Each structure stands twice: as structure tokens, then as C-alpha cells.
Design a protein around this ligand. Structure first.
Ligand code: M0E
Ligand code: AIX
Length: 695
């Protein structure tokens, strides 16, 4: 009868199901989604007898997205007591060794970490890793962070099932519409969805359905990129992974699945709160949660938001730039490990945010800007980078794009050149301080003056005092005698771009326009003791399969002699102690900081190079329109550095003298003496018998 039309239509939709099975299979049995590249900060490893205090550790933990509690229950939490800290270190897929949860007690003895013990067996650790903070993702227009089935708490699955579905066969229906279908309200779509769902549940286990659903679900928007899945939304909304969510935060994310844009907590927080509360009760009907919990959860805010799009634009410019140079875009699930220090960045960002309007008010300024570059003294690894006064939201990066006159910050390269000649130039060497009238080409005289337009009553100064005081006249007399090609060579060795070097007499006093990052490289070279460590933001880039796509190795090259670098830095400590930066030296006398101040003609640029035990901080404070700032090195850029130093626990500079360094006695006349002397200065000699030749 009509079975010639009935059965043929049953075997017509059947072959369509084979095409549908092949479509669902080809996506899952391969690549489900293109997962963006995860960007992680620095990986800190803690060791016994490490120079780190309890308070510094609290700040480090808090900067690593840890929460200070009274009773430790879940990971990413810590408790602080009299002379120790207890913490549950969150699981992390470290490149060296994959680690899980660990209960550790960090014991402190003054300013140092005494011991780190495993609270499971009371065994002392040799080294203890600390997971890196996730900075951002490198963007399809959709952003994800894949977490397998095990990564999700059993409670969160139960929170999702109670609000959504029973699950005994819809949860699998919603999955297929987001994964393969259109946005349409249509009945064809609903039929195509339900038919796909029946094929979906049959060929794949309930664990896989949950794994795919929990990672696909649209839960937010960050401008042009779509925040989807529970793991990324957990970090975007609170700053905690999916494994560390509290029941109230857990319920909000499970609530947004129905309408992420309207149930959003940034815009209309009441509709989001009403929904969260409209989720907590749904769990309450079921025997899973007790009546005791509901009341406290309803009153306590679900958000609790960070609260905020483009994280770390300045530092990210460098990360992207290095990624192209070293290597990538085709690959998915890439983990990029950086050298980013969250503690340093916070200290710097706060200094810029607070300090800039503070200087703008103090000096009645229309506009003022900054640039801060923190690099490791010995590795050149970039710790912090701020490209402005408002660094949370940026497009124009002053640390990398703004090319400005270095001013006096050019002076140590002249004195370093001189001090690389131990038989000729020493700290006690007399340099002439009398009017200069050098004839430049065209027949036009170049007459450089000291800041006060004065000269020494003796017509001379000790090399040490000339750098200490940032005296222009003696600097010119030193560099001209040395030669411009020798000073230009010191700049090449230091690590400044060659194409910026124009060796004219003016180069000695600051006619060298560099960006704060480039200046960092130069000062890093002196601070390390003469070894030039090419600046880097990249530590390692790892693939989804754990393959090492790129690995960072030291490229440190001996640029200047250690003894010459030591003597420049020793004088750079004199700068901060009694010289131009004496305001900083009085504020932090136990830090024995090396530093140099820079002010350009008509107060256009203010600079400060700050060296402590472990970092090199280059800070510039100026205006984009190149107008006078009314600030000096010590008033502008050094003040932002003072703020940066205060916002953290800086390392005291213990300038360990290399070989052939000998503290020698000097008379008023500048002559070496066997015993006594009115001045003690470090000298580069294997045999301090320069005094016998002098006597
Ligand atoms: O089949 C249809 C499908 O029709 P839908 O409307 O898509 O399904 C919704 O209604 C269902 C129902 N039968 O009651 C459901 C309630 O069971 C659905 O919830 C589910 N499946 O679990 C509900 O789907 C949800 O619908 C939301 C949008 O529908 C809104 O529903 C309200 C009440 O039902 C209405 O008042 C709204 O008018 C209606 O819009 C899905 O959220 C949307 O997800 C989209 C991807 C978002 O688009 C983005 O939005 C961004 C943005 O807004 N900013 C950008 O513009 C961006 O460019 C853009 O791509 C979009 O902003 C976002 N809109 C809302 C309100 O959340 C959201 O992604 C989607 N959830 C899932 C798990 O797939 C059906 O079964 O009904
Ligand atoms: C370096 O920046 C030097 N600055 C100047 O010579 C400027 N021409 C100048 C600005 C303002 C007043 C006089 C000169 C020297 N170092 C400065 C500093 O350390 O900040 C300086 C003012 C001591 S002079």
C-alpha cells in the first residue's frame, strides 16, 4: 500500500543520519575547536635560605591569584601565622614536571625563607615551584581554555545538571546547536538538533558530552572576542580556575548559560544577582545542598568581580614581537611562558597611576606621561613594562615606541670608557673644569656649561665627583680626550641600536635618542658587571602535545671589563648617596642603590636608571607634545622610582668587588698614600704599589 512511500522515507532519513554521524565524528575525532595561545607569567621556585620575607610572600601569593583564608579547604588558598605561611599550591602542568596539589608550610627567619615542608609527611623541600599567573590569551573571534573531565569539580557538574538536565538518555541537544548549527528559532533546526543529539549520546560517553559542553558554552564577551566555556569564564569573572570556584560563583556561571549577555554581572548586576539566587534554590529543592547554606550564599555577592579586556598591552607588544622573531599561528593549545613579574608590574603600574597626577597637581601640568622598564640585572629578562600613566587601557606604548633624548643618562658610558683603562683613568684622576669653546663645523662654537653655569675654584675635579655630580664640562673634557669612536664603541658593547649612534661632540651629553627599553639594555650591561644579556620577554613556548617549540638560553656576552663596570657602579652609588640622586639615597640608605639622573634641555625629558640587588629600572617622565615638564631627574622620574621601590621589597645592592679591586687612600691633592688618606677609593690594581710610585 503506502508502505512504498512510508518505509522509503524511513530509509531516506537513515542515510541522512549516516551523513550526520560522519559530520559529528570528523569534528570530535580530530580538532573540536582552535584554542588560543595561553600566556603565563614567570615561574618562581622557592628554596631554603632564600632572601624572601613572610609579607613579601603574601604579596607574591596574592599576585599569583591566591586567596588569604583562616581555614584551608581548596587549592589556590593560603593562611598566614606569626613566623610562617601554609598553602595549597594549585595543580599546574609545569614544563619541567607535571604537578598536582601540595600542602606546604613556608617557615621564615627574619628576611629569609627558613624551610618549605610537605604538610603530608613533614619533609623539607629542596626547591618548591610556584605556578605562573595567566596574563592573557592570543585570540574565529572566540577564546577558550581547555580543561578535561577530571578538572571540573563533581559539585559543579551537579550544579549544572540541577539547573539544566537529569541526564539518563536536553544537555546533549544544546551542545550540537552551538557546535554544528545556526542561531535560528526554526522547527527544522530543532528537528536537526534532536536528531543530532540522539546520534551524539550513542557514539560518545556521558563524560565526553560534559567535557565538550563545559568548554563550548558561551558565558561572556570581552569586546570583539567571545568568552566561552567554564574554565576561561572562571578566570575572566573572578580570577580563579574552574577547580577553585565557591558554590555561589559556581551557580552564577551555571546561570549565565541561558542568557550570558543579559545575566552578565558588569552591566545590570541586579538581574545577574536575581539569576544567581534563582539558581541556588534549584539546587536546594534537591537533597544535595542543606538549608543552612542558602541564606549566607544569597546575601554574599556572587561578584566579587576583579572588576573590569586587553591585559598588559605594553608587555604584550614585546611578547608578540619576540614570538615573530623567534618563530606558530597554525598550532592550537599553545602555552607561552614569559618572564613577567606580577609583583613588579603592580609596583610599577601603581607608581605610574598615583605618581603622574601627583606630579601634574604639584607642578600645575596640563598633561604628563611615563614609561617604566624593569629588567633582571643578570639575565636581562623583562620583569615589568608600563607604557603610560593609564596602563590598564593602552594603544601607544611609551616603553617601546617613545624615542627620547637620554640626557645625562649618557654620562656613565664616557666614564666607563675611561675606567676601562686602569693605567690611565682612575676615580682620583683630575679632569679640567674651566670654560670650553669647541669649534664644530661651519665655524660655529659649541660652549657646553655645567647646570649652575659655574666652574671649580681649582679649575679641576676628580673623575669620581664629575660623574657623581653629573658635571657637563668635565664629561666633555673626558670624552674628547678619550675620543668619540671609543665612547661610540662602549655604546655598541652596552647594547644600544647602532643606527642611533651619530658620533658628534654633543653625543657625550645626551644627543642619543633612545626608547626606555633600549636604555635598560645599556644599564643592564653595566649592572651585570659588564656582560650584555639581550633583553627577553620569552622563557619557553610549549605545544598541546608537550613539544618544546622554543626554549630560552643565556646569550650573555662580555662587553666591558668587570673592574670598569664595578667602578662605574660604585660611582653610581655615590650619585644616589651624595650626588644628584641624594634624595633617594636618604630615603633608602640600606639599599645602597646605584643610579643616574637625566634631565634634558628646557626640562623636556626626565630620566632615572635605578639599580638594586636584582633589577635594573629605567624610568622616563615627560610629555608627548615635547613641552617643558618643570621636573628634573630627581623630581620627576626618580620620584616614580621611589614610589615603585616603596610599593615592593627591593633587594639591597651588595656590590661584590671583582678581582684586582683594591680600596686605596687618597690625599686632598688626589695623590695615593701608603697609609691613611682623607679619601678611600676602589682602584683596579693587582699590586696596590701605585702609592710607592706616587710617594
Ligand atoms: O532552538 C531554539 C533555540 O533558540 P534559542 O533562543 O537560541 O534558545 C534559548 O531558549 C531556550 C528555550 N527553548 O527556552 C533555552 C532556554 O532552553 C535556551 O537555553 C539553553 N539551550 O540551554 C536558550 O539558549 C540560549 O539562548 C540565549 C539567547 O536567547 C535569549 O533567550 C531569552 C529568553 O529565552 C530571550 O529573552 C532573548 O531574547 C534571547 O536572545 C543564548 O545567549 C546568547 O548567546 C549568543 C552567542 C550571544 O551572541 C553574542 O552576543 C554578544 C553580545 O551580546 N555582546 C555579541 O553581540 C556577539 O557578536 C554575539 O555573537 C547572545 O548575546 C546571547 N543572548 C542572550 C540573551 O544571552 C544562549 O547561548 C543559549 N544557550 C545555550 C546553552 O545554547 C529553542 O530551543 O528555543
Ligand atoms: C643631564 O640630564 C644633564 N642635564 C642638563 O645638562 C640639562 N641641560 C639641564 C637641565 C636643567 C638644568 C641644567 C641643565 C645634567 N644632569 C642633570 C640631572 O642629573 O638631572 C642635571 C640637571 C644635574 S645637569
Amino acid at each position: 500500500l503506502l508502505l512504498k512511500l512510508a518505509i522509503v522515507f524511513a530509509v531516506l532519513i537513515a542515510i541522512y543520519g549516516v551523513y550526520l554521524d560522519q559530520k559529528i565524528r570528523s569534528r570530535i575525532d580530530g580538532k573540536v575547536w582552535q584554542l588560543p595561545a595561553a600566556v603565563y607569567g614567570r615561574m618562581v621556585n622557592l628554596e631554603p635560605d632564600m632572601t624572601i620575607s613572610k609579607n613579601e610572600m603574601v604579596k607574591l601569593l596574592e599576585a599569583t591569584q591566591y586567596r588569604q583564608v583562616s581555614k584551608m579547604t581548596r587549592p589556590g588558598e593560603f593562611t598566614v601565622q606569626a613566623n610562617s605561611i601554609e598553602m595549597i599550591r594549585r595543580p599546574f602542568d609545569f614544563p619541567d614536571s607535571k604537578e598536582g596539589q601540595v600542602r606546604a608550610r613556608l617557615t621564615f627567619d627574619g628576611d629569609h625563607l627558613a624551610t618549605i615542608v610537605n604538610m603530608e609527611n613533614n619533609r623539607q623541600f629542596g626547591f618548591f615551584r610556584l605556578d605562573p599567573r595567566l596574563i592573557t590569551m592570543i585570540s574565529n573571534g572566540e577564546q577558550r581554555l581547555f580543561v578535561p573531565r577530571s578538572g571540573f569539580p563533581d559539585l559543579l557538574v551537579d550544579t549544572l545538571l540541577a539547573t539544566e538536565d537529569r541526564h539518563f538518555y536536553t544537555l546533549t541537544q544544546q551542545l550540537v546547536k552551538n557546535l554544528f548549527l545556526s542561531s535560528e528559532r526554526s522547527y527544522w533546526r530543532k528537528a536537526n538538533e534532536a536528531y543530532m543529539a540522539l546520534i551524539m549520546d550513542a557514539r560518545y560517553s556521558k563524560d565526553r558530552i560534559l567535557e565538550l559542553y563545559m568548554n563550548e558554552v558561551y558565558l561572556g564577551q570581552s569586546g570583539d572576542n567571545e568568552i566561552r566555556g567554564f574554565p576561561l569564564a572562571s578566570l575572566y569573572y573572578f580570577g580563579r580556575p574552574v577547580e577553585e570556584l565557591s558554590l555561589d560563583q559556581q551557580a552564577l556561571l551555571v546561570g549565565m548559560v541561558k542568557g550570558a549577555s543579559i545575566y552578565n554581572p558588569w552591566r545590570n548586576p541586579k538581574l545577574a544577582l536575581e539569576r544567581r539566587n534563582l539558581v541556588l534554590r534549584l539546587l536546594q529543592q534537591q537533597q544535595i545542598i542543606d538549608q543552612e547554606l542558602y541564606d549566607m550564599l544569597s546575601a554574599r555577592p556572587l561578584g566579587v568581580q576583579p572588576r573590569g579586556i586587553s591585559p598588559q598591552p605594553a608587555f604584550m607588544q614585546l611578547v608578540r614581537q619576540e614570538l615573530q622573531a623567534k618563530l606558530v599561528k597554525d598550532l592550537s593549545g599553545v602555552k607561552i611562558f614569559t618572564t613577567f613579574d606580577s609583583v613588579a608590574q603592580d609596583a610599577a603600574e601603581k607608581a605610574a597611576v598615583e605618581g603622574i597626577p601627583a606630579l601634574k597637581k604639584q607642578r600645575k601640568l596640563s598633561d604628563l606621561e611615563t614609561a617604566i622598564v624593569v629588567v633582571d640585572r643578570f639575565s636581562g629578562e623583562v620583569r615589568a613594562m608600563v607604557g603610560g600613566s593609564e596602563p590598564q587601557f593602552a594603544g601607544y606604548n611609551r616603553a617601546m615606541q617613545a624615542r627620547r633624548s637620554i640626557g645625562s643618562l649618557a654620562k656613565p658610558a664616557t666614564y666607563l670608557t675611561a675606567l676601562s683603562q686602569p693605567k690611565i683613568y682612575r676615580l682620583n684622576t683630575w679632569i679640567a673644569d674651566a670654560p670650553i669653546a669647541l669649534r664644530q663645523p661651519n665655524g660655529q662654537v659649541w660652549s657646553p656649561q655645567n647646570d649652575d653655569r659655574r666652574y671649580s675654584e681649582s679649575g679641576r675635579v676628580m673623575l669620581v665627583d664629575a660623574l657623581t655630580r653629573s658635571m657637563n664640562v668635565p664629561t666633555v673634557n673626558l670624552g674628547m680626550a678619550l675620543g668619540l669612536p671609543a665612547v661610540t664603541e662602549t655604546w655598541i658593547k652596552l647594547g644600544v641600536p647602532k643606527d642611533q649612534l651619530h658620533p658628534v661632540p654633543a653625543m657625550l651629553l645626551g644627543a642619543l635618542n633612545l626608547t626606555p627599553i633600549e636604555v635598560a639594555q645599556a644599564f643592564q650591561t653595566i649592572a651585570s658587571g659588564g656582560n650584555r644579556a639581550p633583553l627577553s620577554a620569552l622563557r619557553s613556548v610549549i605545544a598541546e602535545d608537550g613539544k618544546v617549540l622554543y626554549q630560552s638560553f643565556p646569550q650573555a656576552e662580555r662587553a666591558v671589563p668587570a673592574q670598569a663596570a664595578y667602578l662605574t657602579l660604585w660611582t653610581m652609588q655615590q650619585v644616589v648617596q651624595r650626588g644628584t640622586g641624594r634624595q633617594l639615597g636618604a630615603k633608602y640608605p640600606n639599599l645602597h642603590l646605584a643610579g643616574k639622573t637625566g634631565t634634558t634641555n628646557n626640562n623636556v625629558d626626565t630620566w632615572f636608571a635605578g639599580i638594586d640587588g636584582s633589577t635594573v629600572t629605567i624610568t622616563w617622565v615627560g610629555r608627548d607634545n615635547n613641552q617643558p615638564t618643570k621636573l628634573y631627574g630627581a623630581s620627576g622620574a626618580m620620584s616614580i622610582y621611589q614610589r615603585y621601590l616603596a610599593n615592593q621589597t627591593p633587594t639591597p645592592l651588595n656590590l661584590v668587588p671583582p678581582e684586582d679591586i683594591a680600596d686605596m687612600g687618597v690625599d686632598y691633592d688626589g695623590n695615593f698614600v701608603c697609609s691613611g688618606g682623607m679619601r678611600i677609593l676602589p682602584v683596579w690594581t693587582s699590586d696596590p704599589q701605585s702609592l710607592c710610585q706616587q710617594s
